Symmetry: D2
Subunit: 268 residues, 4 copies
Amino acid sequence: TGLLDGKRILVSGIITDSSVAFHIARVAQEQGAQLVLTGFDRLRLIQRITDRLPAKAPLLELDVQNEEHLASLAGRVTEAIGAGNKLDGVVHSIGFMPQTGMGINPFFDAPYADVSKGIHISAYSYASMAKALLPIMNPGGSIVGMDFDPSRAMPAYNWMTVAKSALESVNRFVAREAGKYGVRSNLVAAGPIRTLAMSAIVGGALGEEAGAQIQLLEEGWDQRAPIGWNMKDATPVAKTVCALLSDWLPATTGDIIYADGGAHTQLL
Amino acid sequence: TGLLDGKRILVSGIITDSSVAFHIARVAQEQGAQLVLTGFDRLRLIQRITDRLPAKAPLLELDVQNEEHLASLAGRVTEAIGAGNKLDGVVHSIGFMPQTGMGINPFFDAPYADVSKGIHISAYSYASMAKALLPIMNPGGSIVGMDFDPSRAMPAYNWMTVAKSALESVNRFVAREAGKYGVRSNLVAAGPIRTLAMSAIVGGALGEEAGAQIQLLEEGWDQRAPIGWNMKDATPVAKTVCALLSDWLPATTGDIIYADGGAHTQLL
Amino acid sequence: TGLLDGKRILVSGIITDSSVAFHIARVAQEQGAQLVLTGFDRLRLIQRITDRLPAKAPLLELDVQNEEHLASLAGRVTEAIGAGNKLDGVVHSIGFMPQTGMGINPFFDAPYADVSKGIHISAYSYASMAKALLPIMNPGGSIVGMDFDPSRAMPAYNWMTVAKSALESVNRFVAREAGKYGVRSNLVAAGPIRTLAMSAIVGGALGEEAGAQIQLLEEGWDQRAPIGWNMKDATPVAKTVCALLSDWLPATTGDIIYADGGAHTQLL
Amino acid sequence: TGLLDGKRILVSGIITDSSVAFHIARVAQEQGAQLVLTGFDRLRLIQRITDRLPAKAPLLELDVQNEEHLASLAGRVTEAIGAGNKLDGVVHSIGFMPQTGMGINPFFDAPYADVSKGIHISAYSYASMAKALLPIMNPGGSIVGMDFDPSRAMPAYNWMTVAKSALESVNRFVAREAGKYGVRSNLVAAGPIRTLAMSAIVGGALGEEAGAQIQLLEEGWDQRAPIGWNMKDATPVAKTVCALLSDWLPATTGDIIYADGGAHTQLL
Ligand SMILES: NC(=O)C1=CN([C@@H]2O[C@H](COP(=O)(O)OP(=O)(O)OC[C@H]3O[C@@H](n4cnc5c(N)ncnc54)[C@H](O)[C@@H]3O)[C@@H](O)[C@H]2O)C=CC1
Ligand SMILES: NC(=O)C1=CN([C@@H]2O[C@H](COP(=O)(O)OP(=O)(O)OC[C@H]3O[C@@H](n4cnc5c(N)ncnc54)[C@H](O)[C@@H]3O)[C@@H](O)[C@H]2O)C=CC1
Ligand SMILES: NC(=O)C1=CN([C@@H]2O[C@H](COP(=O)(O)OP(=O)(O)OC[C@H]3O[C@@H](n4cnc5c(N)ncnc54)[C@H](O)[C@@H]3O)[C@@H](O)[C@H]2O)C=CC1
Ligand SMILES: NC(=O)C1=CN([C@@H]2O[C@H](COP(=O)(O)OP(=O)(O)OC[C@H]3O[C@@H](n4cnc5c(N)ncnc54)[C@H](O)[C@@H]3O)[C@@H](O)[C@H]2O)C=CC1
């Protein structure tokens, strides 16, 4: 019971318990939402991970690059939530960019095939998911994707930043479509969260200079953030996602909410 | 009970029952907040107006241009809410620009004395209010001001748009100060709301061409808005203000939330 | 002689005499630049078109999706301009999005393969071109790409707008690379220009509703533009491109100059 | 002779030889412009300073807060340039904020009277100057003001940043007016320039912490700037101002050109 009581919400993007989407799922359940989860490749893993969620939630396979998965998606969700029931919320918390598109690999050296896959999973799939799910969403519904502010270039994030810029653009178009359904579409631009991958890149997985730069990035983020930024705490971002899934931001779409400690509003 | 249960929130800016702040007050009370109101010049009027709020709320005079009012403000609020109690939220819903700074009066013809008064009440007072009230705000608190997106120029709004640009700048600095207190500071950029004044300007009070332009503005807003925009309904904006007053946007400050139907994210 | 006197500048993107790049080429030559042109598929056509340029300019084939073309590009340019000579400027005036990614074809119905090709040619190729050409660019050099402001969604332009958002992101990264060479990288966001394709879409080639919307778009652009916008005149944009190719914007990179009549700075 | 040959251009804001406007004046003269200068309080000083300009230029007193100065301004300029001659360019390079509005003085402690004076001189005067001078400007003319990117808050700059936000807003409205005259209005957002005042604040004139912060600000600016930023060199900014005064940015108004080394396009 609470912020999302009675809402049926699909949450994609759980892969581990430090997945941003894990915390989104957890908070949404604490707030009364009934979840359907989608998981990409390692469903056994994901099932075991989501066992620790406050409540049980059906898990559906969704490889966002798999047209059949997307084509079957709404029927599978309807099976999961019961005929005559629709989704009130959809959470896109998916992103990927091949290593060549990031870190120390020179920006110019990322082969387009890699970039394109990154943009497919990280940006285009936002529209894919909305296409699959809008038919089974209620008026007053909410689609939320995860963004990392790409409005300025930065070290290491390279083509993933490009992918986020594309995602932000996609979101504005998804909002136009979603609006026909009485549905809002918005992004949450989060501060840096020490996910496994972020920890790995800080630890030098994508090159020492990239690691050093990302560390400087996270330090400066907390410094700039008027209320600070705790990269080890995804809860403030999960809460923000939940804010958008709720009825409490009913006049916002095609938009980006910055759950980044206010870092983006401050130069130094 | 609900979104704001237990929160003590000061709401400025009620002058009539069509004041944006009236609806902010109403929704906040429906959501469990305990209010203190401030009212500017016509306290008898404002008291009679706020009698229709779901709950009684002490009303304090606050002329934001009156240094003594601001100097006494926190003690008066403490009297009203009880010693040992602090505010959790502050709503700045105040704005004013002399007629010369708006409408058909040529932009170049607004005397600086008029502009300055407009900027005093509409922008600087955001910092004034934060200065007066941050000492009596709890950690986790929230200050929210009302904004109208000034990022592009527009007909008729003239120097009030300039004042909003200044307000947005002020908010970013107020966030820096507020952050020391564990307090967030944010603006809600609302779509156009058919307040008495907006109705009056549509009806030609500031010149026929200004009226015509503002009418075109509100029509285009609803057209652009992916979810539409109902200028006769301040509830979606009151709800958004409440979202920011709540614990559900805990990593956003110095920021602007657009409760405008998504109009600003769409060109045409 | 003039603004670009002595500069050696590669201009991509001429396909017809109404190509934005044709006018960029023409103005650059009027201003003293020595050009190398690249042309994509119809070289005989392009040669015949560029015969009308004020001066002769070597034409090199460049299919931006062809890795060999890009791999050979700098040597071919060096052959064309003479060993020991480098480029001072590069103009990316290339864009393409399959029909499915635009117009009346539902946004959700653009297959990723189409989108990806669009993003390849329209966004990624900006980095491709910079990768190929930075080794043969002089310090103080300038790379300029053509942008159409994607900061808000719009009818009909659909995935091309997404591609522009990606391009703007790419440009910011290209600037980081280009900076190592003493080279600036910038976009020109032009107003709508009645190119063959734009005329075709206005005339209904991508659906009547798309045509109607684009017509409304161009009308509103001129209305919003404080100095007007003449979609039949690419000269103000060619001049702006030339401004960026010149030494007169020497502290601007990763940036976007808006040659749009000021339309983007105005709401209504 | 050159970029501005034959143009008659009013350049305000020279106070010393390290004034940004001194370099704007110098470059404009090197480029063929005929100047009229305006100077604020110390005309003897300013005359002696501008004696070192490449060419002689009439100097007119203009206190932008003095309505009579502004009321007489266009006739005095016409006297200076000759009846039947008009201005082609106007440079607003004026700014001021009382000490209370900056540095270590708490943001909340700047009395509105101080802020208002700051906003008067730094923002409103942009409109004042355009009002005074548009009647005596040629079609194809250009008004340029000096901006410091206020889109994010920063240490020390406090209410001057607010003033710049207001200036940027004013510029968008001035463009609407200027457009009626065939005149463009634009800002140049410069990187930090080690003007006397900036040197003084770095040296602790407005508090040690403000000095330290501004020093960090200038260091980070050069680091972020893809082409670097040399705060001791106003020439790249003078050149940019000249770019806008020229015919080479003929489709840009109400706009801001960033002569900041690209720093604003980069996060880290
Ligand atoms: N960690 C951070 O600092 C920030 C992350 N974000 C965004 O949050 C979102 C979630 O990522 P995180 O939780 O950080 O990492 P994560 O690695 O835990 O989540 C990424 C998810 O994307 C899924 N995915 C990858 N390819 C897929 C495909 N083909 N089909 C379906 N799912 C696929 C993965 O299985 C995984 O669940 C991403 O969009 C990310 O860019 C935004 C701001 C900051
Ligand atoms: N009506 C609209 O379309 C939009 C309004 N807003 C903003 O919402 C806020 C509230 O305005 P509305 O509700 O529309 O109009 P309103 O006229 O009902 O509220 C303005 C309030 O400001 C108060 N005020 C004026 N001078 C004051 C002073 N010296 N000291 C203390 N209070 C003073 C008035 O008493 C009144 O309560 C304003 O900031 C306005 O700019 C934002 C977007 C759109
Ligand atoms: N026409 C307009 O209203 C606006 C156009 N722009 C941009 O200006 C640029 C030039 O386009 P326009 O002159 O309008 O149209 P255009 O059709 O004359 O130019 C597009 C060019 O891209 C080239 N191209 C396509 N695929 C290519 C590939 N594989 N390799 C190399 N070149 C390829 C074409 O051959 C053609 O020369 C584009 O980036 C466009 O998006 C920007 C704002 C407005
Ligand atoms: N120095 C810097 O790092 C940056 C400065 N700018 C802007 O460049 C512009 C010029 O300032 P700077 O050259 O840096 O300093 P400056 O101190 O040399 O120029 C300021 C000018 O404003 C004039 N002024 C002050 N009050 C006036 C009034 N009542 N009437 C007429 N003129 C008045 C002063 O006499 C002086 O000539 C200002 O708008 C400033 O904010 C923009 C970005 C950075």
